[model samples]
Target chain A: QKSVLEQLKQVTMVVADTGDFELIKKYKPVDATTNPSLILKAVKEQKYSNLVAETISKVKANNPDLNSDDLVKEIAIEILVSFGIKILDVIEGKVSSEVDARVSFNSATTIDYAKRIIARYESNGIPKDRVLIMIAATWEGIKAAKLLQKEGINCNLTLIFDKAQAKACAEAGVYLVSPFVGRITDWQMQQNNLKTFPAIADDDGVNSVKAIYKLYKSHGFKTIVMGASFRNVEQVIALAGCDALTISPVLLEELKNRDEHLEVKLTQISEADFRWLMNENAMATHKLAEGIRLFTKDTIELENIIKQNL
Target chain B: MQKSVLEQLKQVTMVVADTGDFELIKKYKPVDATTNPSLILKAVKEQKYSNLVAETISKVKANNPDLNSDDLVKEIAIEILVSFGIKILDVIEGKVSSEVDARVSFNSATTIDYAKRIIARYESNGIPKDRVLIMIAATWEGIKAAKLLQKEGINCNLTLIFDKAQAKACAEAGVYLVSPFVGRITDWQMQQNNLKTFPAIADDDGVNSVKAIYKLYKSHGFKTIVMGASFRNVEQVIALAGCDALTISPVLLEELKNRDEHLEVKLTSPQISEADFRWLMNENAMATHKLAEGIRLFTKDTIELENIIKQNL
Candidate 1:
């Protein structure tokens, strides 16, 4: 059977949006995204053991005076870099690593946090071009990426729900914006109280990406509109020809065997229009805040893994 | 142009003072007023209300001497609820909202029975049902109880509104009034964003929440009056100047009374479906969380007041 994935590959660059090595190998995609949450989850499940913490332990031996938490922070960054380095081994194009979520509200801190990750990746012989720094899409986060992008450090402004966030990300000249298709629809359906969603075409989630994709293309912004955080394959398939899509491996596996032909749908507003819509749309407003909180929590908790190994 | 903000606000908006202090209501008279267990709990602890509490405690003891301590606490709390309503009613010509027990919030039957008992005390003491709105949480069960009460021509003011779903459901049930919160929504947003200052006044989450609901109710021709409750600052109040009603705390009222400005901002009105209403509440974390938080605080305050009543006897 011909794979819908093969057809999708003909048009869109499919990226593995996970940290599992085996899953990445199976899809054999062009790129990968490992936000702190994804990295934490992978580190948690794999139990990479002492082999992974060797760089951490060997560094700690000479630096006895280092504050333990300070060491753990570097260790966590190194551990994340190691995963990035490992994920880089299989994927050909690029890997996106996350900045610390604690700096999401502070542009100055976010820039510094992003620089540390970039410097760590460079210290390991991984060129900065092969890595994109993932950041939350808050106002401060977007401004941080504005400065990072100028330094040749590409950014993937994620947790994007409202069009205004995506608009800001594009204006900042970032590398990509992972506007979630399914999450917006999920919030809408949850708010609308519908058990069964409108079909994939009529779906608010599918339509959100279509509109965002259209906005990027209509303006000829080179910013890659990578739709992320899908609830189902119908959603992924709905954005079949997006500039990119970071799909979970389960949805990737679902697409690998299907034989259906894929098509594109997506398509935005003035500043007033964007903010007004965001201000009026409670779903987008609430989900964006909740998404940042979710990532920040996982980013903080990842410290535990570094501590346990410390 | 030099009129105080309070005077200008009253020119276009129905200002409602939220409190249980009788004198405070007299000082800054409102067309309507609100009373909750938390406010009453605080009011009962004050020096001025101590005489009233003593008299209410003695009146309950004399009327129910054979009743146990449990009845003493129960009767005294109920008498305080209504007697406080009676005092506020005498000060302001408009209605006063007396809340039903928060514990009965989830049961329509109990809420209905409680409302009738509250109304009976008011009527027996020469206050009419029309002069008081039996305040209930805007839970679906609570709305159902209010709907039944509405059929009997007893007005209801549904409180703790946080979403369009609640507003939509209340209007659909022909509720007399719905109090959508402003400060709490703004506070929740500030806490979530870890913000030191609020978003620009135009983009304030709490102000927009009420604006959205007011527009929804007004556009759809729903008869339910949208009374904006809770206040964090004078700015929030002035923003909703032309709203159907804006309930202010005595602190915010004083803030407005102290300042002089003919404010330009004013509110004008603001649906949702049934299935949508259920889902909106399910997904709106702030609404669901705050709705529950409000009930818990009120319940906690009611219990504390009851304990005080017991010690009073």
Candidate 2:
């Protein structure tokens, strides 16, 4: 008998959902994803401060002709890529680097930012295949991801809480879509009168990813469905056979400590078109807005830190 | 005896420090300090505030390890901002304008909830509502939030004002104060006309816009305080001397501080009949663009501030 984490790994690929290098090394997630929020936490630690300082000096030293403001502006992206470089060094699989969430609503701007992020990664000698550009599930984000995908730049359509978002991501041919399970559960918990954990079959968060997974399986969509933002072990165990699961350090520890056998809860796939139900639900709407707000906020602060550091 | 520019300007209008730099605020001794996210983001970079950032993060961590990191980030942001606000209050005698999250500019309920949270944070620190002015965007939603806030005896600073319509709406809503921007308007007009010369005080678009707003507020006897902000030059500052108040930046304050020049009152309040007014979004291009531009810029800073909190956390 093996721990649930190991047994589950046999069925699905588990990725680390943090920017903490130590945790990444400890958990040994094959693929890792980084966002403004995660990168922010990583950059502020005493261990990471040297990373930021050195990246700043190295970038400035490399581009001597660039003016102060231009150099400063480039540092925000470089800092994120710098973290990506370090994470890449730790993980053998690709790293999902997010374009600024502030530009999520503008397709052109999102594409521009994705190109810049990819260029920065390339400059650091990281191949394009090793990096996945994460974007929001908005129409603009979908459009940007599609264009980037055509250029062989993989995108992880993230902050996905609705079937609409998942469907859109699939239609746009994104490399992968992270259907945020825990946030959906959080929104439903707030709206409903429930106090305790409901059955996995009754959980909105578990069902959301199930719905997205079914739709993808039914339609034979090639876009990878990566379950993300888990709140508990049950939600993680419920989606046992998802294509991928990005587990946080806290939840990953729970999975590692458990020895219970996991069952594949979702097995049916129908060809029924679920596009009509793709309307953004209340739970999805609230959580999506909240996610963008927080991510956008962290991104702004990161830029400020970079500018001031310069 | 010729009164110094600062002294003469003060005789006609209250002086407010339009900066986040505490050192500058202490030097000028402006009655109030007005800060938007842009200012706060710029100020947080100094090494002096690193401990404040770390302390805020540690406190949030100890007290709220269970809270989702996203929500925790917001809480940390409010704490960091309140820390700065408390420091500013210690230096200035009058009120400090703490801007609500610019991301909620279009959402009335969200804006209201955020405003109340900010007020609660300040009050938790033993600061009264009167000593703080909650700054909201000058949008319809913002005006609605201001009305609700003012009804609670909370002062609201309606900022990003560029048109008479926005000003009139602020006054009608009984907003505590409205900052009519002078420099942004001038910038827009200059770019539009492609004029090579700096227009005189009367024709200066920003100065003229403030002049018109001053007339409207004073002529109607509205209680809303008209504070001219975002000045491009000392001439614009001197021109709006008697317009209730002027929030000058440290740069222009230093200029005025050095010049020993007397200034005359340029505005006065008188009663007038009410007239119909509307801020049709399509009707005013300059205000519309500038208002959106201002919000975008501040929202950018708001993002940076959150990023800073994330880095600190």
Candidate 3:
């Protein structure tokens, strides 16, 4: 497996996964994803805290007795656009700003959210093409992405995990698709103890992305596959040949500040290639449920923490 | 704070917080609450849940000789409902909703299978179907599945809901309850271009999406319930005063519990019918977009949560 950074020498691009402007400057992944959770986390930080309050006050003063949350939403958008615009000022490609996670399941509504996000960027004098309203790849998500793109609002299809999801997104002609490789590794590790059982490389996360990448490459799908959600350097190395890989700064630092032996490998998927879509084998029988429960728990805890702090 | 929460519930609404954290339920004290695959998964990870997990795991192992982590997970869910419901009972006056699985948003049969299994678990633990709401996503398949489950005396929490059509379909299907997310609504609204002004709760665009659904249910005299979920702020909560019940965040709950402001019930079934809402639905594109975006985002999160469960379990 080659590192994605090394693989970047190939046609594959790299996008950063961060909410912080300084962090975006440090490693410079091509795109970034910002959420309520991340923005909420950023606003609580001492540096960004003032921006949150200032943005809130500006929106609140505009419409007195307005929903303070809506004001915060505006402020958060402003912060995200400002950061994204700043990143755009640095990078050659686009940045994805997400709608609130609270609405990921609603397809019809997400299209509007994408437009709103794009409008915010355009209103701020940033070009619409520079911003991809990152929609979560649910059924509604794929539909929204398709609609947004039809309206000429470019979209980054994100939070994709399953091939069933990827097929749906690809069918929609997505501007880009971010498949979470690290999160997949995290799932694989829990199912089969990674530390204890080390020989299961094929049953590993690399294979998951390799399959998705191969399929995308083989088919003439215009939708680009951007690998995301890495836990370590190994996963990034595994998916180095992907169209693009959005690495968190910590992992990007490991790739940039360290060794560079691994190189890009994957090209297009051939017509003769035959691989079955993962069926019940890929579906969550037990492991997936446990994973969801744990994440939900931590997120709620984080949300509660924000509530306490707010 | 002076608003009569109970009265507003009868006309507009009340939503309980369904969670494993007894402390959160105790603090927020919503009228009703709900939980799902991820929330239950989290509770089992703690050292505090060793005994609970052990007992559930043993049962799962017995149920499936080839017991993998997934079987143990099913057993773990049973334990969660057993544990979570006890905590929920301490907080709300109405039902507590436990979701089947957000990952099964598209698969009707799987949703039905899980819904029955969860309800059986809840009933076996002495909680009646009326008191236990089976939460399902508002997919075409999910809604159909919920309709079937509802016919069997099971109450359903139609979750992952966005768009007026989904709500309209749920009402048409006669599902027990629905959760329309406010925070998610605002999240999509943030992306709109033509809106020179942010919408007030009274605004027909975003806020009234939920309001229209509420009135639709009332106008038809459908027994389906509407409980606003995933609020972004206290003011959003205030704007939704006439909602049947709003399942508020702890932060918003704090503001509601402590403030001296009078939160008027601005929305009602009668008001919805009397108003020219046809134009409201036609003119607003942001609400439509936000509602659609909200669903996609939640579905994504639900998938991400599923991935989280897959990794950890």
Candidate 4:
């Protein structure tokens, strides 16, 4: 019988699908995703309260005159740094800390946020390679990711939807792109009735990951596709062979528990897959621009959630 | 009128708000309210939701014993959605769709199950099922589930919809509604050209999509509710007036509601004011097939949205 560790070794570098330190420690995923909503939720939990105190002290010690709002950002960064450090200790891979979703549409703002997050992480003996600053897949976000990439900082581009957004991320040469599976399905079911899908696959979420996966693997681009935001087991099965998939422990547990023949579907070097192509600029531009605005709206909401808690 | 008005016109015929901000909805007051996973994600993060979240956590903790984390999440989601609907109910009489959980979207049986679950909740809380539309994505499976739901008198809000054929098929199946995305439509068009220059959306592909769908729906007099969702700006919104319904954001809604000034309706019924035009609209086999191909292309994008949402979720 293969040991659990040995089984994990054969699989892809498992990424912990959580914003909580305890969960990260327990599952020990290679990478971690910390976003506004996720981190905010974690902060409210009693287990993560120490992060807030650690941050408040550090900010007070460093800049005594920091106001409440700036202090909030300080606290948020501190918590992220703490989580990132803890996650790094367990997994050799990078911990993805998201840029403030509120600033996702603004390149300059995102860049500034990125710098602040990086400062927090680096202050605690963590190197840049162990940290991947996450950005939403906005036009400005793509530009911001490119700027960070130019500075040798790998980024995980989240909130990616549509081929235009994916192509734009590719054009910008992002290090990793997390195509959401759940949100897409939610939108499809909510928007239309039982007759057609907005996308080409049986399940919009799974099909989308497969498309982007196929795009990256088949194309010459080195942009890593990390399938995130799983809504069901189907999405996991659809994106089984992507570059990396950040699965929630809840779903991961289900998969781990399931007794079935799990087959690997995504082939990196396939002959027939490379023929796919991007069609037009109007669609790509409108789609990406729209996606950015949509995500910006969500990010702003998440920020509000944080403020409400504070 | 100003000179060189980006030549923005009413070619598209209707614009919709792609959000759940009540302020935005009140301001633009697009003919309808279209809520999706992303839009609601932003809305619930506001300071406004503090009480809602607190109250919900308390209620869930008290009402349900031994609830898992997922149940708590679902409860919170439902509470947040219901809150938005309650706030939005005052603004418009058309519809305010609360989206089903994305996780269950692919499973038709589950999709219907969730729709019924949400509708039942709404009814028990005094909001009739007709008033609170259950939103679903335009997946084949999703539609199949919706078809079942509609038969049971549960209304649905189908979203992330693109392509004329998808619209036609939904109409044929008698789905409750559809939200054809304008901004996403424009995105696909831009990619086809490797677009360095984001040109003014004239009679281009994005505008053409709504126009074709609108014409088809109006011509066939299909009962499938067509509400265009997801927009980039007030300009795009103005360009799509007269659509079956347009869901406007609070920002654009504010622009429209606050100012008594003129923002031309780029899309008017006049352009589509032809009962006779439907008679000569038979396309060649190539065009007919191409229209179906377009639907498939658009469908490809909805899945991309799923990919992104899964990561964030």
Candidate 5:
């Protein structure tokens, strides 16, 4: 019997959803995903502090003439790309450096910010394809993402709780969608007012991911579905046959220790019909906006960290 | 099972003829027929229904000789609709969709009162409530009127369903059938997706719009039937073969009768709460603009039909 992680890799491409390069190296995932939240968490650590401190000082020294909000934001992205470059050095596939959530509602600004991200990665000798520019799955954000896609920039649309977001992404020819499994199930648990917690198969988030997975496959959408934000190992293991999975470090450790039979749970059946906006449940809109809001907060927090170091 | 395309389509889908004339209904032999202001105008344009139009104006004028032209014109339009409804009911085996006047669409009380008058006409003519679906636009007020109307044994057919949320509200209200526009949906999408180019039949925007509503209805076990209306081509009809019903025009019905393609049941099928429904519809530009424009367009045709009545009076 092999480890669940080992078996999962055979079926789904394993992506480490973290900013900690050391932990990522331990898990040996193909790609590493990072957002403002993960980046903020990683920046407070001593191991990653020097990278932030150095990026701030180096950007200020190189462009001493450069303390407008523009200069600090440049520094923020520089720090973000700094993490991307380091994570890129270890990962086999790619590093998803996020676009700032502050520009989430403006398509033009989101495009410019995404270009800035890939520009920094390319400047460091990283090709564009190896770095997925992650953006929120808002209508404006997806609109920006589609234009970037036309210019050969791949996007990972995050915070997708409803098929409306996923369908728009697929229509735009987006590269991938990261369905937050745990947050959806968490919201459902409360809204449903359940006495007992749901099992893996009955999990709203897991089944949501399954619905989206089947949706993409049924419609023959090229946009890959990567299940992310897990609350348990069962949720992660449940989607063993997903196209890709952005496993958190905590569950990556569990998958590493747990040696068991990994059953394939998700597949594209002809019977599954998920073509339209499966009616955006109130939970979907609330969670999506809340997620964007939280990421925007972390993005501001990361920028403050840059200013403090400067 | 293996035969005429029209026969095959009828096997799985309730092929409802959408028109004002009963001649084509006699030729095609569709189970049901749907009518609105535009179809009435088109049929009136042919002059074959001038006597029907004349009968409505003079008869209503004699009965309500004290009324003004504005109110009398409204009365004639109602009689015109009810007369055609009664005439068409004799030919078709199933019901007819007698639309409530577009003028009263936004006011639930006005819509409900107008619907009662139309059903009252049908009742005097010996037609049961089930045979005449009081067709109304799926506006919030229009849907509310249908809800109360359904409770009174007056079955309602909610038309102009561009958004799935519209279907959700109609199903919640327990309306009889929903006429989700198929061709108008693709028309709006064609304007947005890429101007000057039509999407493939499989990717037709409107077909999927109705397909989504049908799936929504089936998934929730809602009693409302999804009758797809408006079509620019035969492929759209073929794509939605297993829908609860499809309102096809005569030319398309002719095309289906002539074509050799074997149509199969393609539709294999959200609580979507109220806040979620309104919020999503607000975000969806296509649904928002289309629902508004759909009401206006129907109202415009109704006024033009009323204008034709004004000329004879």
Candidate 6:
């Protein structure tokens, strides 16, 4: 019998949300994605030591007179590039490389970094179309993406937890938007101190993505809605008919072993009442900062590893 | 007894270095020091202090292995900032004014949070809150953050101040100090007038701005210190002789030390002018343009500093 993973693919595009090459190769998903956290985790594994060593040796030899600080940071980017080059070889779709989130609020710097990242990927033989620059979904990020899109650079506006972010990304004409599903759900549960949700329909995470998806469809915005940050298989299945869902391997495995029937929950496609959603919602504001904080920590840890090696 | 411009000003007013160069601070021995992103950028280019830059990077890397290179670069910046402040403190007897990011001028909460972080870092290095002046923009939000910081016993330097309204608000908010730019104010007037070479002390419109502000402060019994900043020439420094202080660049300080200009107290009046603060600020075109221009200039320098950090990272 065909597994649900194969059937789910009929309705939605599946993107592997990890940097682990083994899982990526095994699942053979259409696309693969990475961030500082995934890249950090991958480099820490014993199997990825060769890539790390190769990046360091290659970076040091070419830029011998580069300051230790510059050398280390370049090596960090090189490590991501090395992994990205390998992932492109395995996937038929694009890979998203995030610019430094620390420059999340500075539009010019974000645009500059995005250009540099795209150039780096192209230098490694990956065409511009195969690479997507991921930026935080802040106001500055939307402006940057607008400028980058004008220059033919694709952008994935990520960490979107509210309708305002989605609206901004759509107006910017970004290539993709990652409305984080599981993290929003987790934040909702944590806010109310609930161990579980009543239903997927009422789940804040699912509802957020659903509202964004409906808004995009109603407005006829071509920006792709790619759901990300899944906490469990249920959330993934609930968003079955989404334009795309970049899921972790754990949930991919759960779907691979099951033959259960999955139905789409967000097909009704009602337009969003964005006014109320964009108002002063402390949950969205607080959760966005929380997500940025966690990602910032992982980015720092990744730099630390590179610094130690240097 | 008369003193030279630099010496005479030292008798009644405290002098502070407006540059981030430690060597200049050591040579001039200003009572205090002030630093912004612009000065820091200029200092980072010195080949003699390349080791300081390298050491700052190494020390921050060793101490904070968990920070991403971007955040690590920020840590490195703060460390280098505090390190320069420490060197200044060793040579001088007064506080150091370290500015917050100009990009957060419109956000009070973020500005307050960032100010607290800077203060905490300084305190960790054994420097007390009193020894550091947290500089913020003189915008409405910056004023709000300054009030909060002052309540917490953290001193603030309300900077980029041009109009009398901004100064009045700073005083009411109980900020520690305000930096009124005389040179930029004069630059605006001269550009508008399409004329140059106004008489050094008498015809200078910028001097009149500070002179008026000094009268308003001394008359109202306001405790907020008025430090005239951004001087075009030593003549501007000579014009504001008896005010609170003047943060002069090295070139101006050297000029003041070499010249024997008569130091007179032109701002000794104790009667506040009857002019409406808001009305006058609104009426003055030069102040308005210069104030916005100053903020934009600082914001540009801040972004430049971030780019420099990123390149080195």
Best by TM-score: 1
lDDT of 2 by residue, A1-310 (tens): 7888888888888899887867888777889988889888777665788889998999898889998777876888898888888889998899988888767657888899999999999988999999999998765678788899999999999988888668877887889999988887776776675787778788888898999999999999999889998778888999989999999888888988888877866552111122112221445544565677689778877877887787
lDDT, residue A23, model 1? 72
Chain B, candidate 6: TM?
Answer: 0.92
Q: State the lDDT of candidate 5 residue by residue for A76-109, as single tens digits.
A: 8898889988998898898898888767767888
Worst 10 residues of 1 chain A by lDDT: A266-275
The segments of candidate 5 whose C-alpha lies over 4 angstroms from its true place after superposition are A267-280, B1-313
DockQ per candidate = 0.02, 0.01, 0.02, 0.01, 0.02, 0.01
Docking class of 2: incorrect
* Estimated TM-score for each candidate: 0.54, 0.51, 0.49, 0.47, 0.52, 0.52
- Candidate 6 C-alpha lDDT tens digits along B98-139: 888776776788889989988888888898888999989786
After aligning candidate 4 to the native by TM-score, how far in Å is the CA of B222 from where it should be?
42
Q: How close is candidate 3 to the true structure, as a TM-score?
A: 0.49
- The TM-score of predicted model 4 comes to 0.47
Residue by residue across A1-310, what tens digits does model 6's lDDT show? Answer: 6788887888888999888877787777887889888988898875788889888999899887999888877787788888888888888888888888767767888899898788778877888999889998766678899999999999999989897669878988899999998878887887678987648878889888999999999989999999999888888888989999998999899988889788766551111223123223555655555556677778888888888877
User: Model 2 misses residue A141 by how many Å?
Assistant: 26
Give the lowest summed-lDDT range of ten residues in model 6 chain B: B269-278
TM-score of candidate 1 relative to the true fold: 0.54
Q: DockQ score for model 4, please?
A: 0.01
Model 1, range B1-313, lDDT digits (tens) per residue? 4788888888888889999988999888789999999999988998888898889889879989898888778778889999899999999989999999887876788889999999999999999899999999997778989999999988999999998789889998999999999999998999878899877778788899889988987878888999999988888888888998988999999999888866776675124443345445645779866776787678889999988887777
TM-score of chain B of each: 0.96, 0.94, 0.76, 0.75, 0.94, 0.92
How close to the true structure is residue B97 of candidate 3, measured as C-alpha lDDT?
Answer: 75
DockQ of 6: 0.01
Residue pairs in steric clash, candidate 2?
A: A298-B306, A298-B307, A300-B303, A300-B304, A301-B303, A301-B304, A301-B305, A301-B307, A301-B308, A302-B307
Residue B294 C-alpha lDDT in model 5 = 66
